[PDB]
């Protein structure tokens, strides 16, 4: 090995063209059927505590 290294500074064009994917992609939420708050699905509702429509987590 002989320490490989960038040959030219990368332009803003390429630099930013690379990041063309870093696009963050929002969480996925659904209505708790009970508190109707938004929360991620298949989790136990952090706000009311119910899941499959029963008390599970003493909030």
């Amino acid at each position: 090995a002989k320490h490989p290294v960038p040959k030219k500074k990368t332009s803003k064009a390429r630099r930013d063209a690379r990041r063309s994917h870093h696009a963050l992609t929002p969480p996925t939420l659904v209505p708790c059927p009970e508190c109707k708050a938004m929360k991620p699905p298949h989790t136990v509702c952090p706000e009311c505590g119910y899941y499959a429509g029963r008390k599970v987590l003493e909030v």
Binding site: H22, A23, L24, P26, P27, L29, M38, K39, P40
Partner: protein
């Protein structure tokens, strides 16, 4: 009207935290509320503060009502950077820049 909150000199990297903001720049107040809450970034907390707070101001200081609110614009400019010295092999010291961010959330009301 337009309501504005601005947190400046915040010790997170701009480039990392823009990515929380682009996820709201647009949304309702309520949508931005529920995004920045399940978004899994550090930026989540920081930006959900500014937001939350600009929606004070709108109500309290600017006679606006919540459920007309939406994140009209929201950008992040780059604050001056804590320069730090991290030591490498054979005694070279390289410089870390613990970078810094000026977060901005700007609210408006949506008629509809």
């Amino acid at each position: 009207m337009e309501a504005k909150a601005i947190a400046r000199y915040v010790r997170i990297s701009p480039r990392k935290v823009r990515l929380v903001v682009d996820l709201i720049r647009g949304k309702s107040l309520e949508e931005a509320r529920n995004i920045l809450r399940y978004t899994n970034k550090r930026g989540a907390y920081f930006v959900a503060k500014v937001l939350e707070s600009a929606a004070a101001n709108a109500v309290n200081n600017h006679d606006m009502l919540e459920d007309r609110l939406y994140v009209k614009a929201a950008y992040v400019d780059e604050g001056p950077a804590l320069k730090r010295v991290l030591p490498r092999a054979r005694g070279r010291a390289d410089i870390i820049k613990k970078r810094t961010s000026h977060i901005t959330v700007i609210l408006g009301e949506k008629h509809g």
